[PDB]
Amino acid sequence: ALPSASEEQVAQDTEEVFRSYVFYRHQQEQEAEGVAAPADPEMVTLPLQPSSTMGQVGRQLAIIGDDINRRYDSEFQTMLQHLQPTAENAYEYFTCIATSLFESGINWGRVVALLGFGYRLALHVYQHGLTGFLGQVTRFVVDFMLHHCIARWIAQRGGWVAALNLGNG
Amino acid sequence: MQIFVKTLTGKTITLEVEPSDTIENVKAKIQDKEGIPPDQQRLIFAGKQLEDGRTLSDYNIQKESTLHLVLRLRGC
């Protein structure tokens, strides 16, 4: 695409890179285990658009955060069960862990870790019985990212197109 | 013995404790030299959330060991 980017186009590439990443991450985890597996390969699958350059952004971010993700993952669900949040206070708990994580500062490792622990959380309600939460989590994070001035920083870092200019690029 | 705790800011702080020390004591030492309330501490070792009713020998932590530190805040 073209260089430079505003906060108006960052909210669109943020939502597209948020699912394209959790998808390629659960797709490979399905071969090893089936924990929090998807609804089987059918119409209820996740139809992403890999025809765009953002398709390669999720694949890369899913590689630099592969081992660091499993390192502290068995403890994320263990404490998540002791939480037992609700649809009325779902943003009151998630906004707490995040603000408690970036409280020290902001880095590429703190963004991938956020999405990593931003999946099972939503799916945890889907199974519970609250069908129709995926649209809620989307129209919730994008608002937190634009309210916490996260979109700007990403714009100063070169937008999401700066991912190709990282380690494995 | 001496242990090394790693934070999410890239800062590592040393700590002098003993295998018979309880997890509640090590947390008090961190707030005494750092000021971080024990209610907002999520130690992590081997992908296991150590409990507050067990000692360090319970997990088999030797000397020169490293433990990650997360955070759950107390306001929310």
Side-chain angles (χ1 to χ4, degrees):
Chain A
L2 289 294
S4 96
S6 276
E7 294 180 48
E8 69 190 1
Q9 57 137 288
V10 170
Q12 191 281 330
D13 63 18
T14 299
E15 291 174 349
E16 184 177 0
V17 167
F18 246 56
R19 351 296 268 169
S20 78
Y21 164 27
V22 77
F23 299 169
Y24 276 117
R25 195 261 292 177
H26 94 255
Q27 185 63 57
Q28 300 299 302
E29 292 288 348
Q30 187 178 355
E31 180 62 22
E33 291 173 348
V35 173
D40 335 333
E42 229 294 300
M43 291 178 176
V44 202
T45 44
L46 327 308
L48 194 271
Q49 302 299 308
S51 66
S52 297
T53 60
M54 296 296 172
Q56 188 63 56
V57 172
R59 183 77 175 280
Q60 174 55 254
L61 127 65
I63 278 274
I64 49 173
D66 183 353
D67 290 346
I68 308 110
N69 187 31
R70 292 179 181 180
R71 273 271 73 77
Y72 319 122
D73 173 86
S74 294
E75 98 305 352
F76 104 69
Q77 66 190 67
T78 299
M79 71 190 185
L80 197 290
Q81 191 281 330
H82 292 81
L83 263 68
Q84 200 179 304
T86 64
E88 293 178 353
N89 62 16
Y91 148 76
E92 293 177 351
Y93 272 75
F94 314 162
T95 191
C96 199
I97 286 273
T99 301
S100 201
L101 249 63
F102 329 143
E103 188 177 0
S104 138
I106 186 167
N107 201 34
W108 68 270
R110 263 59 266 177
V111 329
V112 51
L114 177 59
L115 172 148
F117 166 55
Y119 78 132
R120 171 58 169 172
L121 250 171
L123 295 173
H124 186 275
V125 339
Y126 180 83
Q127 290 180 43
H128 181 71
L130 288 168
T131 183
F133 203 63
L134 181 64
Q136 296 298 312
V137 183
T138 300
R139 244 297 102 77
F140 248 124
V141 297
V142 69
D143 199 18
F144 185 79
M145 291 223 162
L146 266 64
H147 271 305
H148 171 36
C149 317
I150 289 295
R152 182 180 65 81
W153 181 255
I154 294 300
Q156 186 178 316
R157 195 178 185 278
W160 263 116
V161 178
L164 196 82
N165 298 319
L166 218 84
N168 286 337
Chain B
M1 315 173 179
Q2 327 295 68
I3 249 71
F4 293 80
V5 315
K6 182 178 181 296
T7 66
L8 280 62
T9 320
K11 215 293 191 180
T12 61
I13 300 170
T14 66
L15 200 68
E16 302 183 354
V17 300
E18 297 179 357
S20 180
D21 197 28
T22 304
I23 270 76
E24 78 86 32
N25 184 355
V26 323
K27 288 183 177 296
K29 206 83 170 183
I30 292 169
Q31 92 193 66
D32 290 346
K33 289 181 178 295
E34 201 169 0
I36 297 171
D39 289 344
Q40 315 184 15
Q41 284 290 99
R42 165 55 284 153
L43 200 163
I44 291 170
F45 198 77
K48 201 92 181 297
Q49 308 187 248
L50 301 178
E51 301 293 341
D52 291 346
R54 305 294 190 84
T55 175
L56 296 174
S57 294
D58 183 358
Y59 210 84
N60 213 243
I61 93 80
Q62 302 299 302
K63 61 183 178 64
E64 303 291 338
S65 179
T66 301
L67 11 167
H68 210 68
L69 296 176
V70 203
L71 218 83
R72 53 171 55 83
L73 239 167
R74 177 172 175 80
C76 34

